[model samples]
Target: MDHDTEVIVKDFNSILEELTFNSRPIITTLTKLAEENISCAQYFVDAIESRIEKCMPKQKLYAFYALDSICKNVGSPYTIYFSRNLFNLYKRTYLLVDNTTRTKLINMFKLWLNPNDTGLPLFEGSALEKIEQFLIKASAAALE
Candidate 1:
């Protein structure tokens, strides 16, 4: 929000906009930036959430992948913020990914990449936990 913060935010967003996932350089840069100005984290989250409904067929899967990596590094507090969005994303994405595309689909969530691509119990925490369990079960029944 300050001049310096606004400046860094632009820089941070450029990296995010330029590339989508596992651009370890951006992750690495963001981690350093996060350490430099912890307050910037919210802006980062806000930016990601703004595009929560946009991905893949809608356009390209961008924001959420970066979010997962950011959360993984920053840890649970921020991770919790994106948890619900991820759940919805997973649910929405689950049906879109079919047998052959499974590999690429799983790769798309590289940061929070789960072992079982077909599984829908793919989130963390209590509110998120039950949804995962329910979705995975339902996903199994419906898919097969």
Candidate 2:
């Protein structure tokens, strides 16, 4: 890699490592930073996209896993926001990716946020279920 690419990789790796261990408050901090430093977020996204594009077929699974982990670690408030951004990003990039990669990302989002047994999927069901129960409680908490 060139010097600029190396620097970008280093910065991306550091941010990702911090994000891996982030608490909900840290996610808030990141969101604020993202708002203040739009360039930084865009740069980070570009570097990540470059890395994902270079991933070997087998390694692509881990890339998706890492992306999911990052989103989940951001917790509820940031998950909602991040998912919005991801939805847009996916739309923009979806056609550029190989079919397999696109499918993997779609499946990853479903598996992470819409698990069949429980979790966010409950919000879509006939009767408000356990996950919806938690969602209601969470939304109520956010009001306070």
Candidate 3:
């Protein structure tokens, strides 16, 4: 089940280990390269999901930031891959980060649910609602 994207996926995982907010340029370049190799989109999503599950909280945040860049910069054909796993990935990350990072994460969700330059939301409404409801309860839980 390996594709050439496995190497790129591994490379992205390594880069993510030390990834920072300052790494936007690298994220954009890698994201474009990934779009060019969209045939391996599933492998890319699988690797990213696994990384989010296993990495440290900061690393997980960086990975999502990278995904944010990926989703925004690419077309729906490529975005659909990440969208497939978006809810699970977001739920895990939402619980893993601190309140400060949670604010940023929620903001990203807001953008995803809003209209993009193309005048459509990045994620389908159905999927976004699922995450939205979970976020509501999670936010409420934090108040308890």
Candidate 4:
């Protein structure tokens, strides 16, 4: 992996390790979301988002991944709080990504969700078509 990708992967794994036990509840909520059960997922997402936000006030990337994990299981929240501290930190240290990197990030999202891809599946959908549609919309917004 490149430098920033390495940092992100390391951070993601660290957060996952810290949040391992919470995965049970998260998976259960994700299953509910897969069933087209939005209310339950929404409630879970809200609760967890609040918890993550509080616990990770200085770790925006961690918070972002936590939120991303939740959104992959359910649907992306309409809004999220990106801590200015963390954003500025990354902005100062990371390689400045151009539009090409943005596009590549979106593509990575697709590869991430592929069943044949290595590691755990990162997303779910009630149907295959919905998965593609979700990817299209999500990739577009994420890139922007």
Candidate 5:
């Protein structure tokens, strides 16, 4: 990460730290930042992943929601970048969040699978199937 990239990542982390369902401004700012720096899509996902690992449970939900917002607003390349680690992040968070948050997380993926309703075809084909399998395995693993 160069100086500019580092600055963007720092800003991303801070904004995501403040994310919540009611924080529309935060969502919009993050989305605009993503649109402006599409090249840093992976870095944005990386920042989300890092926050998910260490943040509070409520904040984890907000982080995932932020990703949801970003995917919906920015679309495509951001979706592809998020796909690489979303399931991994999901599995990790699934174990830590309460049942309601867990349900929200699964519901978000369900939206990804149902692109017709979303009007955004994301994680399609192999990636879509991969998400399905990961959910199955992650849930089953949780039972163990």
Candidate 6:
């Protein structure tokens, strides 16, 4: 089946070409527009996860932030498509980071595991999709 994200499905082949460049240069280019204009981070998650297992260890946190912010703002439900790998990357993002991203991690696991709980701050969306309806849809999508 096609990837659930429009950006992912459209750029499936483009992200492949991204693997060939030294990548840092392109990352720099993306960084220039990333702060508020980073649209559809689903593509970033797809591209980043595509070859992360083979690349040099990236310990920096900001590398993940740009993508995280965009996805949380735009693709809250759709991100469940590959939340596990994204979660792993998000977990590793704490290396050398200051208190910025680390603080949000503590209370979230409770919410992540308990999807039906209603007290989470909806203003900022989850890195993982723990919403009950999507959980059902995601599971059913898996069977197909």
lDDT of 4 by residue, 25-101 (tens): 54444444424543233344444444444443333234334545444444433112222122232232122334544
Ten residues in sequence with the least summed lDDT for candidate 3: 135-144
* Model 2 Cα lDDT, one tens digit per residue, 1-144: 567556655655555444433255544544444344443454545544454455454444444454445444433433443443453344444445566665565565446545454556312242223323433453421322
Clashes of each: 0, 0, 0, 0, 0, 0
Give a tens-digit lDDT track for model 3, residues 1-144. Answer: 476656777776676566655477777776886678777676666766777788777778777877777778776665777777778888878887788888888888878865475668887677788888897787622322
Residue 21 Cα positional deviation in candidate 1, in Å, after optimal superposition: 5.1
All candidates in order of TM-score, best leading: 3, 5, 1, 2, 6, 4
Q: Which candidate is the best by lDDT?
A: 5
The TM-score measured for candidate 1 stands at 0.61
- What is the total number of backbone clashes in candidate 6? 0
> Which regions of candidate 4 fall more than 4 Å away from where they truly are?
1-37, 57-60, 76-144
Worst 10 residues of 2 by lDDT: 122-131
How many angstroms is residue 20 displaced in model 5 relative to the true structure, after the best TM-score fit?
A: 6.0
Per-prediction TM-score to the true structure, in the order listed: 0.61, 0.39, 0.81, 0.28, 0.79, 0.33
Q: What is the C-alpha lDDT of each candidate?
A: 0.57, 0.45, 0.73, 0.40, 0.75, 0.43
lDDT tens readout by residue for model 1, 38-131: 7777787666655445545332344545565556555645666666566666666556555444444445444243423444323465545544
Residue 75 CA displacement from its true place in model 6, Å: 2.6
Q: TM-score for model 2?
A: 0.39
Off by over 4 Å in 5: 20-22, 116-120, 130-144
Worst 10 residues of 5 by lDDT: 135-144
Candidates arranged by lDDT, highest first: 5, 3, 1, 2, 6, 4
